[PDB]
Design a binder for this molecule. Structure first.
Ligand SMILES: CC(C)C[C@H](N)C(=O)N1C[C@H](O)C[C@](C)(O)[C@@H](n2cnc3c2c(=O)n(C)c(=O)n3C)C1
Ligand SMILES: C[S@@+](CC[C@H](N)C(=O)[O-])C[C@H]1O[C@@H](n2cnc3c(N)ncnc32)[C@H](O)[C@@H]1O
Ligand SMILES: [Cl-]
Ligand SMILES: [Zn+2]
Ligand SMILES: [Zn+2]
Lengths: 116, 301
């Protein structure tokens, strides 16, 4: 019944004033992309940075099993768009936030499916 | 003049034709650094410029392309260069990478170990190597051709690069190998390319464009490395990050280049002409299977 909870540990470390994980791999791109959250090629728009996905995955970076029962990674081998205001902690961002399954944008950072 | 707006500078053909003797490399701009865009790593910038230059050559780009990347891990535990290669290559390109030490990567598969332990069943369309041992920058000892991973790379190219395929192998003043330069003569064209962001270093990528599997040209590699250093010694390159700000044409064009299986002996002058033009790849199109040899030892008592 015991499993390491890395998500919670990083969230608690951050709140305790810990330095966010570094060396997430930021890509050069046009910043004229779709703005979707996780894509096969960089898609940052004007208000985002695009990062190599593996380098932004808590489980990849910590060398621990992915929560998937099959171990698959949402991010590895893809690019993740991170709001520029949050790009000091991409790992924190991807952990804390969620992608809209309809439009592919981040909930609350591009997703407008819940608007009138 | 305009070299500052290019991704870098390729060694001009006339320097390749000299018969220089090897001297120490003295770069006037040594120690200078380019101003990178905010938050961008040197290795992202470096690989972007390499890929931008590769976009100007006649690379074969088939469906189901296969690319392998040696020396892909950083001291940071991530693979910046792999991330640029995967951005650059068409979506779906099979990308394998490798390094001596553990690292986290976006490649489809990653092999950790000395490169000499890497075996593959299939042939490759593009081989990239950033392999480098900084202990070679010993300026107090003579600068001889090096073996080590270069010996592996030479054999790997001759055995597992598809005809029509291309390579880009990192070298420096002291990290170089004479047989690898000789093997450059087995391509339809070759150069040594220096990135504008790293122009203060004796680093270059030795690029072989469209492999022919036999010598088109006899190259003495000791002389060619001396020619390369002579060029660097007499041609200061202005550090520049300018090309990093225009990514609109970055992606490698998916040319759907044709792939055929052929036996040695069907390779005639029409085939060689197509290979030399980036219009044909020769290899099997089976499944891609790789492995890493593991040495087993029991250290108990
Ligand atoms: C920062 C300053 C501009 C240094 C200045 N350039 C300098 O005074 N020195 C004195 C040394 O005596 C050697 C040398 C050849 O003069 C200079 N240098 C020039 N290019 C070099 C070097 C070097 O060491 N190493 C190890 C290299 O790999 N390359 C490519 C360095
Ligand atoms: C300049 S670095 C890697 C930079 C990396 N490409 C990046 O994108 O940040 C040189 C790499 O070459 C690797 N390497 C060096 N010698 C090797 C050898 N004999 N076999 C396998 N890998 C080697 C090192 O472990 C080292 O990580
Ligand atoms: Cl020669
Ligand atoms: Zn992951
Ligand atoms: Zn939505």
């Amino acid at each position: 019944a015991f499993a390491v909870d890395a998500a919670k540990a990083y969230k608690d470390y951050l709140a305790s004033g810990g330095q966010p994980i570094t060396n997430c791999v930021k890509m050069l791109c046009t910043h004229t992309g779709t703005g979707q959250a996780i894509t096969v090629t960089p898609e940052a728009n004007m208000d985002q940075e695009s990062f190599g996905g593996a380098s932004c995955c808590l489980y990849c970076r910590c060398h621990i099993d992915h929560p998937n029962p099959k171990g698959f990674c949402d991010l590895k081998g893809k690019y993740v768009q991170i709001p520029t205001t949050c790009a000091n902690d991409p790992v924190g961002f991807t952990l804390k936030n969620t992608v809209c399954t309809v439009c592919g944008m981040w909930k609350g950072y591009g997703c407008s499916c819940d608007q009138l | 003049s305009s070299q500052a707006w290019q991704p870098g500078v390729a060694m001009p053909n006339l320097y390749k034709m000299q018969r220089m003797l090897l001297e120490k490399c003295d770069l006037q701009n040594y120690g200078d650094s380019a101003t990178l865009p905010k938050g961008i790593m040197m290795n992202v910038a470096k690989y972007t410029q390499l890929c931008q230059y590769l976009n100007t050559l006649t690379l074969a780009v088939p469906y189901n392309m296969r690319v392998i990347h040696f020396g892909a891990g950083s001291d940071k535990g991530v693979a910046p260069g792999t991330a640029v290669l995967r951005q650059w290559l068409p979506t779906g390109t099979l990308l394998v990478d490798s390094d001596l030490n553990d690292f986290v990567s976006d490649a489809d598969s990653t092999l950790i170990g000395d490169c000499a332990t890497v075996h593959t069943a299939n042939k490759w369309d593009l081989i990239i190597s950033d392999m480098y041992d900084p202990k070679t920058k010993n300026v107090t000892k003579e600068n001889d051709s090096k073996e080590g991973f270069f010996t592996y790379i030479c054999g790997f190219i001759q055995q597992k690069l598809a005809l029509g395929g291309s390579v880009a192998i990192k070298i420096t003043e002291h990290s170089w190998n004479a047989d690898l330069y000789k093997l450059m003569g087995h391509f339809a064209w070759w150069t040594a390319f220096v990135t504008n962001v790293n122009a203060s270093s004796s680093e270059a990528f030795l690029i072989g464009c469209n492999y022919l599997g036999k010598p088109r040209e006899q190259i003495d590699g000791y002389v060619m490395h001396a020619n390369y250093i002579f060029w660097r010694n007499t041609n200061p390159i202005q550090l520049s990050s300018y090309s990093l700000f225009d990514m609109s044409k970055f992606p490698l064009k998916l040319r759907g280049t044709a792939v055929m299986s052929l036996k040695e002996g069907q390779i005639n002058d029409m085939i060689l002409s197509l290979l030399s033009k980036g219009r044909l790849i020769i290899r099997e199109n089976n499944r891609v299977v790789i492995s890493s040899d593991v040495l087993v030892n029991n250290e108990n008592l």
